[PDB]
């Protein structure tokens, strides 16, 4: 079968940071080969299962989250790491049992004239719980003098655009992050290598 990873790797579209797709794969053999051999991977960090032994473990469910984030802040996608991403829009469980892959992709997202297409969550009322989607548009409400659905001194739109340019630098420039999560359940295991 050899279920492809290109559906989540080489797809031209990417939910910015919060509409991140949650694609589950089943009844296949990943083979985890191209994931390790490729030398273009900026970051390849795994927790728990060692990188070499992935093919030897037969799980039952595998999730492949995908998105893009500021290049400098890629480190924030890790267990037990707080900041302005994990704390507001996409948090990972402390006892995580998966891998995270980060690519440097400038030629594909940083347009010469500038790109403002990709959105970014900044403001929220309460902290975020692990593995939850927070697609939202309601205007931020500071509290006292809560205004209404309008922009004012205390009231702000809880979204922003990265504003990518070709020559921002190593940081502040597109990165492409894919998080592979493995889960084992009482149901029979199906996903593993040769």
């Amino acid at each position, epitope marked *: 079968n050899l279920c492809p990873f290109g559906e989540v790797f080489n797809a031209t579209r990417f939910a910015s940071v919060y509409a991140w797709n949650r694609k589950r794969i089943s009844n296949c053999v990943a083979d985890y080969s191209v994931l390790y051999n490729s030398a273009s991977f900026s970051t390849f960090k795994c927790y728990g299962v060692s990188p070499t032994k992935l093919n030897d473990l037969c799980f039952t469910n595998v999730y492949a989250d995908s998105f893009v984030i500021r290049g400098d802040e890629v480190r924030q996608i890790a267990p037990g790491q707080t900041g302005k991403i994990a704390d507001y829009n996409y948090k990972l469980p402390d006892d995580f049992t998966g891998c995270v892959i980060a690519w440097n992709s400038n030629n594909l997202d940083s347009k010469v004239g*500038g790109n403002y297409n990709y959105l970014y969550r900044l403001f929220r009322k309460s902290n975020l719980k692990p593995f939850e989607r927070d697609i939202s548009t309601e205007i931020y409400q500071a509290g006292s003098t809560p205004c209404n659905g309008v922009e004012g001194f205390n009231c702000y739109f809880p979204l922003q*655009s990265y504003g990518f340019q070709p020559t921002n630098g190593v940081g502040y420039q597109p990165y492409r992050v894919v998080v592979l999560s493995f889960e084992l359940l009482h149901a029979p295991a199906t996903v593993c290598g040769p």
Partner: antibody
Amino acid sequence: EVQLVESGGGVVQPGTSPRLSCAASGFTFSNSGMHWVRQAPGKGLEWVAVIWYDGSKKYYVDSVKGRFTISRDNSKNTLYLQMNSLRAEDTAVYYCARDGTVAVRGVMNPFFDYWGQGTLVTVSS
Amino acid sequence: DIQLTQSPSSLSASVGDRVTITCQASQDISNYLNWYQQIPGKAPKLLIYDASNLETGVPSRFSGSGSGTDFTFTISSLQPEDIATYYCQQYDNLPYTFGQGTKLEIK
């Protein structure tokens, strides 16, 4: 090849509104607002005011709210600040610094990366 | 309403000594803070943005860390050049107060 030039200060009498103007050397100026900070003569520095992405938001210091008017001429790629009124505490040096995170549509540069030069605005009669 | 407070407010370390200055902020500030290099009558420029990374151009000796409500800024081997004042500022909440200031001296 980035730098910023300020001017429009000096001996200023009370009740006047001199034009404190600063301009940029070269970049996508229209896509990056800025801020103005004030350096007390020997104490420290707090602020002056803010200018947003498309001249939309105009925030000021609470202590001096409603007095200063800060505007931007995008065509000239310059920023102007006027002085509606003065007290004895406005004897500082004004710096104007660019932005690029949590200040403008599009995060490009780290907050307060360059600054540049200064203008002395001591007020007396 | 944000209030900043730098504990030391004055240092005098040896040329080859490691100086670990600190910055404390009220409420929560998350991961938005910067440190500055105020030489008398000069632009403060920048060393560390987000309190976790050094801007491209500053010497690699300096470093920073911290989160939540507390941050630390470490200088490894300060040369006689590094005798400027240092300020810590947050930029998260619309009122972005500016740190008090810490005069650096030589023993």
